[PDB]
A paper describes a structure:
DNA looping enables bEBP hexamers to engage and actively remodel the RNAP-σ54-DNA closed complex to convert it into an open complex. In this work we capture intermediate states of bEBPs in facilitating DNA opening and partial unfolding of σ54, and therefore link the ATPase activity to DNA opening and σ54 remodeling, which eventually lead to transcription activation.
Interestingly, in this conformation, the hexamer ring has similar tilt as that of RPi (−11/−8) at ~50° while the DNA is bent even further (>70°) compared to that RPi(−11/−8). Despite the conformational differences, similarly to RPi(−12/−11) structure, the protomer that engages with DNA is also at the highest position within the hexamer ring. This interaction is only possible with the tilted ring conformation, suggesting this interaction contributes to the stabilization of this ring conformation in both RPi(−11/−8) and RPi(−10/−1), giving rise to the higher-resolution reconstruction of these conformations. Given the PspF1-275 rings are in similar positions between RPi(−11/−8) and RPi(−10/−1) complexes, we could compare the relative positions of each protomer between RPi(−11/−8) and RPi(−10/−1). Interestingly, protomer 1 in RPi(−10/−1) is shifted significantly toward protomer 6 compared to that of RPi(−11/−8), with the distance between L1 of these two protomers reduced from 27 Å to 4 Å, consistent with our proposed mechanistic model that hydrolysis of protomer 1 at the top of the spiral causes it to relocate downward in the hexamer spiral. Significantly, we observe the σ54 N terminus is further shifted along the PspF hexamer in RPi(−11/−8) and RPi(−10/−1) compared to that of RPi(−12/−11).
Author numbering:
A (entry chain 1), D (entry chain 6): 3 to 258
B (entry chain M): 1 to 48
C (entry chain M): 288 to 382
E (entry chain 5), G (entry chain 3): 1 to 259
F (entry chain 2): 1 to 258
The structure:
């Protein structure tokens, strides 16, 4: 299940995990909310780990990253569409994800036409394919993920309010890890052990009171990886298992 | 949109192929076309 | 003006046309329908060819009017692409 | 009668319905100004049903989302070589608009040139061509829907004054969401029943005094969407007919 | 060369004399400019002028300076040849090329870009131009029609308009009579609007307008001269409801609440 | 494990420390960042790092993070399968796919566009990707590294730089010691430049450097000198053009008419 | 690698030193920058360097900066493979690729785009093929030449150009002598222009210039330098007409409202 890797921020994070697990048997579309650079993929990990999803193939797409003028047509079915003769071409991930999990990542930065097409696909069921003249709704688990406040975008008109409200029935948020400092020491120890294993170090030398105080003082806007990234960088820089670490540098730009 | 001449995008195929009937029509055969029409009318009983 | 006497003309068998629906045999009806479809396609192709030839002739006469006025000695040069431009079909059709 | 969904029990709602029924036979332009949601599109659809040409389709679907060029292109469709070279010829919103009535949602956001073109189409009765090398004539009714003060823009001169005058053959003001007082409970009961039908719950567990007090204190800025969305969210949260409804879910974006 | 009276009304005012003068200009094919505020039947006047000539058999078209896409407007004026821009499926004929030998109406001349002004002045009745991606120039014939609600001499003094364009245009100026000052024709126009509404409303009969409505209309400044008049007539007819007795109320401001 | 060493010419007691840190970092395959200015230069530092890793056997392709075709950027990164698009009949391997098991140096990431930033986004963490022709995505291990000359923290503060991408990348940052900060091996670098240039000019021999020229160089601010110092050396040598007389005067800036 | 004497010779000791430095740099392969006014013969200097270069057979690329279409300008710079983009069928040879192993003298280098600046910097930085659709880079042994009529340090101070690019641009600066710096060579250039004009116009012979003409030349400052001299001499010759008497006055301003 690989859930123990995430290890949760706290029992409150474990409570959200329990709620998500209760929701896992449901294959209805879902909305994922979480801070940028905060383990949002691991949220999709449990949804994929759902037993119904465990049977099918999980497909997750970065909506912001996925962008091309032809790709606008490529996302469309065309499973029989042959304008250049390539009928066998499929909707892509849209066709591939059939029978398994589907996930839209960074959906905020997407063309509005693509959003409407997905919203149209979401509304009712697939029919009247572009080439096949008969699209078919596939019982494939799907969910959406975003970071910013799309409500502000819709207020500015950037967010499709129809899809947003439509997806506003299965929204789950990820609280900032900066709030949960308890698991911070645990995750830091896990990262230290993993680095010691990777760099063939004798063991993790551990932290210090100065190091713990600095970790507390750090704002840590990125926590899932950026905190771990700083941990790994400090482990590499230290190169000394003689003593536990007491000086951790976060801002690489900070000379000396 | 905008006016431009960028040279990289998707497209479709050219004019659809295998228009044999149109190809024969485009060529002019004069009396030979008349002879072919006579042969076809012999083949087609619903033509006069 | 094209030679009307030389212009081919085909007629549809009205008696055969009035015997398709009344047929009680599936094979005979299917054969009649196929023959009618083939005849319609052939007639459409012939009419399209005649219309294209007439349009090409009109375009050439528009070009040839300058040539005819200029005379044989002062005939203007002409290109296949130049004539194909005067029409809407591909230059292959013109050739 | 299409079940009279979202019936306005208010006396002003009944008066507006009577005026619309009087106006529905009239085949003249109509403009609507009101609050967010409020089923204004639903009112337009009911009037279209109230119209004699019940058979005729009413595409409507003119929310202000596309860019200035994009919105006009949607209005003007696409053609061969359009937009300085277009691959596909799109019939566009205008083509679907011909015949039956159409609704213009948030019509104020459009450029004044588009407004002039639309008014000329209304004035002339001949459709405007994206290519422009071919004439076009269309006969259909139209419905206008904005939210701000058209006279304010006219004083500002933003909108075409003649277009505003011609369009406002009959303005349609709307009462506020705060204007309605007693219909809140009726709409809540209707939503609970429709959800129990949809969510297959045995019955609506009923509300409590805390729920009624929160609803009374609720701003409910969304006249239509906010109430329905909040009801759906609360129903999804509860999912049981055993306990009458007492907990209130206010902010979909709420955290912790 | 037919009568085609169509929408001919308001002859009590000097608009009749204006039409009489324009009748002489109708055979003319020189530059034409019309002066008048919005809602003054200016399009109707232009249509009457274009229909007046038997050259109405020729292609009579209208155009207003609505920018839309500036590049698109430039192409429409110029005419996109096939393949001129990326993806151009075929040659797009120019807006000017669409109507040769027939009248052309130019509107919103005040609301015309200075670059657009220069583009238009390029063929300032020059009669010949080149298409977008056109190999050789082409010369056509058309009588342009101009109209605006703004003081072109002022904008020229302001420099907003193109003085060369102003000179190239406006061989004749048609000043619209003030319908706000055309009180005598107002009653006849009201009668015509009532007749049209009775044709449209399909009620039993027109009850009438009494005199309070007429007095209110006299009090009304009628900023919309010919357009708002008919619209207010229709609105008042609708609000009156029953046609038992002549209506005396006036539907002045629909933006204002009915009560 | 072998080292060609290229051309170091660095003994500033801090360039050596930076090189040692890189050597410690050389085994690491995580994404790296370089604070390399023009006057800092040192694009070859990335090449030295690439040679240092065992991926020296692998492809050492460096990505020019600018001058990218806007129309075909997606295919540029990814490439196309045999079907490809309407324009293409064959299979476009793709630049990112062309790199595998080796170092990928993003050169001047600052010049990249926001759309380019989005394209690069999720191309790092995910790794798996499909060709333009479309296929099952595949992730290929390859060393990651990038460089720029400005303060990307400001760009993030400016918002121009995609902060998520920068934060995700750059497991470590390389800071180039300033030429003003170096201030030690000036004479040695000048001698090396003269030795290299003499063969190019087929010059007789090095006339040597006078004390006045050395004092001028010391007083010279020389804010940018990574290649500017060598270029000034070449210009001064061309101006002197006399192997008989030792060098004493150098054109400080090719701007004053003098 | 040839003599190829050029009659356009600067008769100045400063010009002599400039020619000496140019000859010294002619064997050099490092790119250099030419500084000078517009119409200051910089193109002639570039041609002289190209001829005097060791690569006599080496190509001489015009390298106009502002000529870029900017729609696909890099593609022209970078070339392409056969089919690199939509509708492509032949391997496009890049401008540098076309001029590979030759010489490119960046023309209008002052006027260029920032994206153009970045592309040029990338090209300069140990240039490789990296063609559009290219699967493998290459190298080119083509020298580079730079020239502009603007204060590049000032432009950089304005941020108009990339500081690295300018640093990557020149190994030395070729400052053209000012026309005011030039002196007394005006007589020789005037004589050459007179001979050329007499030959072209089929005139009998050169009438010559009088003392008033010499004094005016002394007073006159030619901002365009040779081009200014060429135009003034051309105007004076055209107005001269008959060659019966030597010239005494020349049209100072080709655009003067006087008379
Ligand atoms: N506790 C953990 N165990 C394993 N992997 C983790 C843990 N926390 C973070 N990660 C990894 O760090 C990466 C950071 O991803 P992130 O940037 O948070 O995703 P997103 O941008 O969607 O929020 C994730 O891909 C995840 O695999
Ligand atoms: N003399 C007339 N008789 C009948 N109708 C008229 C007369 N003059 C103007 N009209 C009508 O008044 C309407 C409003 O005119 P106006 O808004 O000025 O048109 P435009 O603004 O397009 O010139 C016109 O549609 C025209 O048909
Ligand atoms: N140890 C060294 N030996 C020789 N040359 C060096 C050494 N270190 C730096 N350089 C020179 O410094 C210059 C910096 O150029 P480059 O790194 O391309 O600039 P940037 O990285 O700012 O684009 C290089 O041309 C290189 O020749
Ligand atoms: N030394 C010279 N003697 C005579 N004529 C010259 C000389 N140098 C330049 N010219 C003329 O002056 C003109 C200057 O043009 P150009 O070379 O473009 O100057 P720039 O490149 O500085 O604009 C040339 O066309 C050339 O004919
Ligand atoms: Mg993420
Ligand atoms: Mg008008
Ligand atoms: Mg470099
Ligand atoms: Mg020049």
């Amino acid at each position: 299940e690989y859930k123990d890797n995430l290890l949760g921020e706290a029992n409150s994070f474990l409570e959200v995990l329990e709620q998500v697990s209760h929701l896992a048997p449901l294959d209805k579309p879902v909305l994922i909310i979480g801070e940028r650079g905060t383990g949002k993929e691991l949220i999709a990990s449990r949804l994929h780990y759902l037993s119904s999803r465990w049977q099918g193939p999980f497909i997750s797409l970065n909506c912001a990253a996925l962008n091309e003028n032809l790709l606008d047509s490529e996302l469309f079915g065309h499973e029989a569409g042959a304008f250049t003769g390539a009928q066998k071409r499929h909707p892509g991930r849209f066709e591939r994800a059939d029978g398994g999990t589907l996930f839209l990542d960074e959906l905020a930065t997407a063309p509005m036409m693509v959003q409407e097409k997905l919203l149209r696909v979401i509304e009712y069921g697939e029919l009247e394919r572009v080439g096949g003249s008969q699209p078919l709704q596939v019982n494939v688990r799907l969910v959406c993920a975003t970071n910013a406040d799309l409500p502000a975008m819709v207020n500015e008109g950037t967010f499709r309010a129809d899809l947003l409200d439509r997806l506003a029935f299965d929204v789950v948020q990820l609280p900032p890890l900066r709030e949960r400092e308890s698991d911070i020491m645990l995750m830091a120890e896990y990262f230290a052990i993993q680095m010691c294993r990777e760099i063939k170090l004798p063991l993790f030398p551990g932290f210090t009171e100065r190091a713990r105080e600095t970790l507390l003082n750090y704002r840590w806007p990125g926590n899932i990886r950026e905190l771990k990234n700083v941990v790994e960088r400090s482990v590499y820089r230290h190169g000394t298992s003689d003593y536990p670490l007491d000086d951790i540098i976060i801002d690489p730009f900070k000379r000396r | 949109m905008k006016q431009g001449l960028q040279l990289r995008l998707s497209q479709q195929l050219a004019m659809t192929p295998q228009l044999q009937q149109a190809i024969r029509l485009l060529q002019l055969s004069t009396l030979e076309l008349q002879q072919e029409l006579q042969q076809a009318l012999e083949s087609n009983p619903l033509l006069e | 003006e094209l030679n009307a006497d030389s212009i081919p003309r085909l007629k549809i068998n009205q008696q055969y046309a009035a015997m398709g629906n009344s047929a009680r045999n599936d094979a005979d009806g299917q054969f009649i329908r196929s023959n009618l479809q083939e005849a319609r396609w052939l007639i459409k192709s012939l009419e399209s060819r005649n219309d294209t030839l007439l349009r090409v002739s009109r375009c050439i006469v528009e070009q040839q009017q300058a040539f005819f006025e200029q005379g044989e000695e002062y005939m203007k040069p002409m290109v296949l692409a130049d004539i194909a431009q005067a029409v809407e079909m591909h230059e292959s059709t013109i050739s």
